[PDB]
Amino acid sequence: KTILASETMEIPEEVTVKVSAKMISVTGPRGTLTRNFKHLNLDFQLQEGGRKLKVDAWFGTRKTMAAIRTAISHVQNLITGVTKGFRYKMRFVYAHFPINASITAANRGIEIRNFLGEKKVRKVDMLDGVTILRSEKVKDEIVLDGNDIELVSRSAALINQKCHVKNKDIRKFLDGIYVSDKGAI
RNA sequence: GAAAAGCCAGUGGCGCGAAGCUACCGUGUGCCGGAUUAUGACUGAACGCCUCUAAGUCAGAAUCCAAGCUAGCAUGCGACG
Ligand SMILES: [Mg+2]
Numbered sequence: 001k002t003i004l005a006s007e008t009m010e011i012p013e014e015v016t017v018k019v020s021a022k023m024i025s026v027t028g029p030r031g032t033l034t035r036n037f038k039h040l041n042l043d044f045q046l047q048e049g050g051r052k053l054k055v056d057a058w059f060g061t062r063k064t065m066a067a068i069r070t071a072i073s074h075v076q077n078l079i080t081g082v083t084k085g086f087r088y089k090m091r092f093v094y095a096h097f098p099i100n101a102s103i104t105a106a107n108r109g110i111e112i113r114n115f116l117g118e119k120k121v122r123k124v125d126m127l128d129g130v131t132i133l134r135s136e137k138v139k140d141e142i143v144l145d146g147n148d149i150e151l152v153s154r155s156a157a158l159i160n161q162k163c164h165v166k167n168k169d170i171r172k173f174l175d176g177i178y179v180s181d182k183g184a185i
Numbered sequence: 186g187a188a189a190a191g192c193c194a195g196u197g198g199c200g201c202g203a204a205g206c207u208a209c210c211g212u213g214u215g216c217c218g219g220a221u222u223a224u225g226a227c228u229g230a231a232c233g234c235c236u237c238u239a240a241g242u243c244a245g246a247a248u249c250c251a252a253g254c255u256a257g258c259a260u261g262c263g264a265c266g
Contacts, residue, residue: 039240066231067240073229074241153227154243161226161244 005057005065007072011050015079019044019053024075028082030147031129035078037071044071080184081147088156089181092140093174099163101142107131110142115163116175124158127151141180149184 011017015028022038037044041064043056055071057064080086092099099115109125110132126132126144130151135141142159146152156179165173 036241041240062231063239068230070228070230070240077228150228150242155227157225157227157243164225 002060002062002065003058005060005068006054007068008052008054009072009076010052012079012083013051014083017046017050017053017075017079019046024078026075026078026082028079030082030085033078033082033148035074037074040067040071042068042071077149081149084184085145085147086149086152086184087146088144088152088179089135089138090142090144090156090159090177091138091180092142093176093178094140095173095175097175099175101134103132103134107133110159112159112163112177116165116173122162124155124162126155130155142177 015026018025018027022036022040022044024035024037024044026033041057043058045054045056046052047054053072053075055068057068060067092101094115097114097117100113102111102113103109104111104123104125107126108131109123112122115122128151129148130144130146132142132144132155135143144152144155146155159177160179163176165175
């Protein structure tokens, strides 16, 4: 019912955005990111020669109007991911059994052992654009690095949800792997 | 006639009895991918914040559909002699 709902962002001078009808390819110093917003039913248009991305919803109801800022902050996340990158920190909480993590192959996955005294060995492989490394200036962290927030955060979530404590009081047996500093550096 | 060999008693009766069938009373074997629910989540709005949800995604089960197993006159079809 609303004639025009538009939002706009700014593109820095280190990153090149190439939008192809909704197929957004972002290029930066760190690499390249890409995404289908081919489902959003919005209007993307670059102005000032690739320095301003301006998004329209014409006759958008409040639902489509809420869909706008998703696209704008998604492409913010791509811009920051491909200029600086995302780096999640993930601390080891263990009550009685030290849980012993070992990387898999050139930092593409982790292997958790001795969790809860269990003998099942926990194996998670990093998704495409994410790597892992054990923390060395911190006591017990694993630090994930990547250019894509979805890939970093999904890998973080796999590691988290693969160390749940079952059949026991989750209010007391707090063992697991949880994320502490989630910014982007 | 008798020994020998039998035969009659609907299978005369008993001991054993191969073969064939057979028994959890004996033996051998029984199944590999993906979708997903309940739930837990990721990025992220509406609502400068938050948010598993609105758009988009994930993990997920004696579940589901295949894979496998059985029939395949489905008046179906292919190669060839
Ligand atoms: Mg016998």
